[PDB]
C-alpha cells in the first residue's frame, strides 16, 4: 500500500525538513525571534532555503551505509569521516576511529543528540529486525558513549517502528515498554511523563532533545503544527526539529507534510529513493 510507503517516506523526509527548519532559528533563546513557519533559509550559516545540515548528512550517509552494505559501522564511520573530511563529540569519535580503527568511537562524554538527529534510516531498514534495538545501540555507539545517549536512541529507535506499525499518539507517548526500565535518571523523568511540560528551549541534551520533540508531538495536532512548536523553542532547533521529523513523518506521513516545504527541500528526490529502497529492504 502507497499508506505503508507514505510512513516510510515521512519519516525520511520529515527529518530533512526538520533539520532545515530548525537551522534557520538554531542558537536563538526562545520566544525572542518571530515565529518560523516557513522555509526561508538564514540563520547563522545564511542557509538557502530549504538546506539542511550535518543532520541529514549523516542520516543520508546511514542510509547509503545500510543500502550498500547491510548494518556494518565500520563503513557508516568510513563514510562519516569522509564526509567530514570533505567539508571545512562527533569529531574526535571520527579521529579517533581515523586512528585506531575502531568503528564505535564514542566516548562516555557523548551525551548529544547527534545519534536521534540521523537514526531514521535505520529503522526504515530493519524495523523487521528482533535486534532493532541493539542495532540502534551500536549505531548511537559509532559517535556517543554516555549511557543517556545510547538508551535515548533506544527510545527513538521503538517509538519509529511502532509510528511506522499505525501505533496511535496515545501509544507512543504512554512509552509502555519503558515504563519501570531501568534507564538514565534523567531519560527516566523523560519516559514518566517529563515532556508533557513545554521546554524553556530547544536542547542538545539526547534525554532533554527526545523530551522536546515528544512535547512537540504531543501538543501538535498535526505534522505542521507539531513542527512550529519544535523549532520555535529555539536552542538546538535543528536537531529538535529532525527528531521530531522523524517521529512525525511516520506517524502523519509524507502526505501530511505542507507540500511547499517538500518541493522547496533539496534534494527531496534523492531522498525520497533511498526511503523507498529502505523500505523494500525491511521487507
Ligand atoms: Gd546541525
Ligand atoms: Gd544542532
Known amino acids: 500500500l502507497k499508506e505503508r510507503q507514505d510512513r ?28 518560523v513557519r516557513e522555509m526561508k533559509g538564514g540563520g547563522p550559516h545564511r542557509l538557502p532555503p530549504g538546506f539542511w545540515t550535518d543532520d541529514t548528512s549523516q542520516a543520508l550517509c546511514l542510509a547509503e551505509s545500510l543500502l550498500q552494505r547491510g548494518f556494518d559501522p565500520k563503513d557508516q564511520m568510513d563514510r562519516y569521516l569522509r564526509w567530514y573530511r570533505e567539508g571545512y563529540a562527533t569529531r574526535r569519535a571520527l579521529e579517533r576511529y581515523a586512528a585506531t580503527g575502531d ?26 529486525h528482533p535486534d532493532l534495538l541493539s542495532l540502534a545501540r551500536r549505531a548511537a555507539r559509532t559517535t556517543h558513549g554516555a549511557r543517556e545517549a545510547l538508551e535515548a536512541t533506544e527510545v527513538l529507535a521503538w517509538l519509529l517502528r511502532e509510528a511506522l506499525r499505525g501505533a496511535p499518539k496515545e501509544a ?19 519516559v514518566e511523563g517529563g515532556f508533557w511540560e513545554a521546554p524553556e528551549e530547544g536542547p542538545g541534551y539526547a534525554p532533554g532533545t527526545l523530551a522536546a520533540a515528544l512535547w512537540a508531538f504531543a501538543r501538535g495536532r498535526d505534522f505542521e503544527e507539531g513542527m512550529r512548536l519544535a523549532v520555535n523553542l529555539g536552542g538546538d532547533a535543528d536537531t529538535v526539529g529532525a527528531v521530531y521529523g522523524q517521529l512525525a513523518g511516520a506517524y502523519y506521513g509524507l502526505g501530511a507534510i505542507p507540500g511547499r516545504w517538500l518541493r522547496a527541500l533539496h534534494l527531496r528526490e534523492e ?5 523507498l529502497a529502505l523500505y523494500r529492504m525491511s521487507m
Do not use: I
Open 8 to 35: 516510510r517516506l515521512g519519516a525520511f523526509l520529515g527529518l530533512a525538513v526538520g533539520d532545515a527548519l530548525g537551522a534557520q532559528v538554531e542558537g536563538l533563546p526562545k520566544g525572542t525571534f518571530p515565529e
Open 103 to 128: 568503528p564505535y568511537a564514542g566516548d562516555e562524554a557523548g551525551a548529544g543528540n547527534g545519534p536521534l538527529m540521523r537514526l531514521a534510516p535505520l529503522v526504515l531498514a530493519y524495523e523487521n
Open 172 to 190: 507512543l507517548l504512554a512509552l509502555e515498554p519503558f515504563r519501570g526500565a531501568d534507564l538514565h535518571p534523567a531519560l527516566r523523568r523523560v
Open 271 to 275: 531522498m525520497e529513493a533511498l526511503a
